[PDB]
């Protein structure tokens, strides 16, 4: 599924991301936009043997188990394929774990580069 901006904002708000650990909702919309272009099926296979999966491009070395990645810790306790669903719940739940395990949103390259220091509220402005 390729979400619209306001659609995805509403789904993320229903799953409690607004002000999660002090990150406003527009941060999370912005991260997904520059990670995956709001595409739930996005994958990126890296040269190091890990793969990034889904709308927040969660990586298989630390967070999910794909059976193909050396070193994997599976800290979100999920198969990586569960992050390729049209339903964002698994991605959201895992992201919450990523930010809590002492990581900020700096964990996401795209957030650090394309969202940090910008007006992220633009990404939800005009939505209901
Ligand atoms: Pt939902
Ligand atoms: Pt829901
Ligand atoms: Pt949820």
Report the distance separating Cα 105 and Cα 63, nearest Å.
Answer: 15
CA 14 – ligand 2 centroid, Å:
6
Resolution (A): 1.4
Multiple choice CATH, 1-128, 3.30.499.10, 1.10.530.10, 3.90.1150.10, 3.30.420.40: 1.10.530.10
Which letter does DSSP use for residue 20 in this model?
A: B
Tokens 């306790």 belong to which residue? 77
Bridge partner residues of 68 (DSSP): none
The set of residues, in sequence order, having a beta carbon less than 8 Å from that of 88 and lying 6+ positions away, is: 8, 11, 12, 15, 40, 55
Cβ count within 10 A of residue 90: 21
- Reply yes or no on whether 52 is catalytic: yes
Report the distance separating Cα 110 and Cα 56, nearest Å.
Answer: 10
Experimental approach was: X-ray
Burial class (CB in 10 A: 0-12, 13-18, 19+), 102: exposed
115 φ, ψ (degrees, to nearest 5):
-120, -40
Q: Do 118 and 105 form a contact (C-beta atoms < 8 A)?
A: no
Closest CA to 21 of 91, 84, 103: 103
Burial class (CB in 10 A: 0-12, 13-18, 19+), 31: buried
Ligand 2 is an ion; its neighbours by CB within 5 Å are 14
Report the distance separating Cα 75 and Cα 63, nearest Å.
Answer: 5
Domain parsing of the chain, residue ranges: 1-128
Give CA 23 to chain center in angstroms: 13
Catalytic residue among 7, 18, 48, 52: 52
Report the distance separating Cα 82 and Cα 65, nearest Å.
Answer: 10
């Amino acid at each position: 599924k390729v979400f619209g901006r306001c659609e995805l904002a509403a789904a993320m708000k229903r799953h409690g991301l607004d002000n999660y650990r002090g990150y406003s909702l527009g941060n999370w919309v912005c991260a997904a936009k520059f990670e995956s272009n709001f595409n739930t099926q996005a994958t990126n296979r890296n040269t190091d043997g890990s793969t990034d999966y889904g709308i927040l491009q969660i990586n298989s070395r630390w967070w999910c188990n794909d059976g193909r990645t050396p070193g994997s810790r599976n800290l979100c306790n999920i198969p990586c394929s569960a992050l390729l669903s049209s339903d964002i719940t698994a991605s959201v739940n895992c992201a919450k774990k990523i930010v809590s395990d002492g990581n900020g949103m700096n964990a996401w390259v795209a957030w650090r580069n394309r969202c940090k220091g910008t007006d992220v509220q633009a990404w939800i402005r005009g939505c209901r």
